[PDB]
Amino acid sequence: SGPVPSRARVYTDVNTHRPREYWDYESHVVEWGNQDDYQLVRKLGRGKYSEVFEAINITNNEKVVVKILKPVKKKKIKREIKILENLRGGPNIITLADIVKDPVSRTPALVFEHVNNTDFKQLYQTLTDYDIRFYMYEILKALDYCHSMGIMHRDVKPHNVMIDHEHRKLRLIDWGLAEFYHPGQEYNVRVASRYFKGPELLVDYQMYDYSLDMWSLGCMLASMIFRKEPFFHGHDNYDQLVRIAKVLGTEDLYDYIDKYNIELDPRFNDILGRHSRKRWERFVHSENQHLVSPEALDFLDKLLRYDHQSRLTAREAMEHPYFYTV
Numbered sequence: 001s002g003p004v005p006s007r008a009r010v011y012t013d014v015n016t017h018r019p020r021e022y023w024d025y026e027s028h029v030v031e032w033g034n035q036d037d038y039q040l041v042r043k044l045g046r047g048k049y050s051e052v053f054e055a056i057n058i059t060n061n062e063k064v065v066v067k068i069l070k071p072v073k074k075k076k077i078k079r080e081i082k083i084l085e086n087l088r089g090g091p092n093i094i095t096l097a098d099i100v101k102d103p104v105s106r107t108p109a110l111v112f113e114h115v116n117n118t119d120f121k122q123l124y125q126t127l128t129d130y131d132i133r134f135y136m137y138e139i140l141k142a143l144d145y146c147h148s149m150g151i152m153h154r155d156v157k158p159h160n161v162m163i164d165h166e167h168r169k170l171r172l173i174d175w176g177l178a179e180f181y182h183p184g185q186e187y188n189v190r191v192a193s194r195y196f197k198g199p200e201l202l203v204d205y206q207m208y209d210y211s212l213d214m215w216s217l218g219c220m221l222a223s224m225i226f227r228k229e230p231f232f233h234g235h236d237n238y239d240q241l242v243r244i245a246k247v248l249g250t251e252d253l254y255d256y257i258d259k260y261n262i263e264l265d266p267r268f269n270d271i272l273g274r275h276s277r278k279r280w281e282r283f284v285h286s287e288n289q290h291l292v293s294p295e296a297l298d299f300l301d302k303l304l305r306y307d308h309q310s311r312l313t314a315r316e317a318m319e320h321p322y323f324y325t326v
């Protein structure tokens with residue numbers, strides 16, 4: 001009767017052993033600071049859930065970033081704040097410096113340490129083989145940390161990874177979609193961003209875990225080493241699974257949905273087709289051959305697996321021969 005349950009193979013019961021206050025974010029009380037301490041410089045951009053501004057902390061001449069959340073639900077604002085405070089000081093985790101009430105949109109505003117990022121469209125075309133490995137290892141430190149802390153980032157992608165290349169400093173930012181992992185909990189599948197959505201999301205499998213972030217990381221690695229942005233370029237959430245099945249094959253996809261007793265949307269019957277897993281050498285060309293190695297391909301192979309339980313964990317990934325050179 002319905003899908004088969006699943007649980008993370010690591011850090012399974014971290015949250016149950018911690019005080020209620022750690023994961024029960026709804027009860028958190030915000031200690032509001034003074035908004036007028038930060039002078040807004042310019043709008044960095046607008047997404048569906050926030051407006052981010054470059055700002056100056058006028059007490060110390062330090063550059064900061066101010067994230068002003070769009071209305072949403074009180075529960076979500078406390079969740080991002082709680083996760084940010086629980087992870088504060090962790091390896092390569094962005095530091096929440098302050099919290100203020102915004103006067104224009106009476107919604108709360110998060111103040112962060114500024115990172116001198118470069119648009120990924122430009123930065124990634126300039127990364128060497130060594131650089132990809134170095135930064136991948138830095139992202140893995142953050143993911144292993146947040147997973148060890150019982151938290152799934154759930155939105156791993158280039159716009160959510162700040163890289164100050166000149167100083168070789170990487171921070172994992174945007175904990176807005178992050179959530180506490182509780183074994184057996186059925187989560188909302190409308191998470192991550194299209195090209196980085198795991199097959200568990202695409203097939204509507206709700207009992208997912210930290211391993212979703214490992215699929216997302218794999219998508220980032222494939223785009224970097226093959227110089228193909230994004231690697232799985234779906235037109236929509238249905239075509240997204242089709243793009244994946246053209247690379248990973250359909251037989252392993254059907255075994256995955258068989259294993260978890262998933263009812264695949266009948267809309268896929270006419271579009272998935274029949275595909276065999278491609279050898280990674282198919283995506284290698286003269287212009288990306290310098291970023292590819294047998295270690296890179298093996299590592300990518302171990303992340304990009306339909307079965308979320310079969311993907312390398314962040315700790316296993318950090319042990320991979322791909323990082324022996326770093």
Ligand SMILES: Nc1ncnc2c1ncn2[C@@H]1O[C@H](COP(=O)(O)OP(=O)(O)O)[C@@H](O)[C@H]1O
Nearest residue numbers: 044047050052065112113114115159173174176
């Ligand atoms: N600490 C930071 N330093 C520099 N730029 C940042 C920082 N935090 C966010 N940004 C920029 O603002 C954007 C939006 O921030 P983010 O937290 O991802 O918001 P959202 O949840 O709305 O996507 C980022 O993608 C990046 O371009």
Ligand SMILES: Nc1ncnc2c1ncn2[C@@H]1O[C@H](COP(=O)(O)OP(=O)(O)O)[C@@H](O)[C@H]1O
Nearest residue numbers: 049076155176177179187188189190191192193
């Ligand atoms: N990048 C995002 N940042 C914040 N909220 C998002 C983002 N993408 C989607 N959402 C919204 O949040 C929902 C998923 O959030 P979540 O808290 O996990 O689910 P639920 O509220 O059902 O428990 C989506 O259905 C959508 O409304």
Ligand SMILES: [Mg+2]
Nearest residue numbers: 047159160174
């Ligand atoms: Mg973001």
Ligand SMILES: [Mg+2]
Nearest residue numbers: 155174176177
């Ligand atoms: Mg976000």
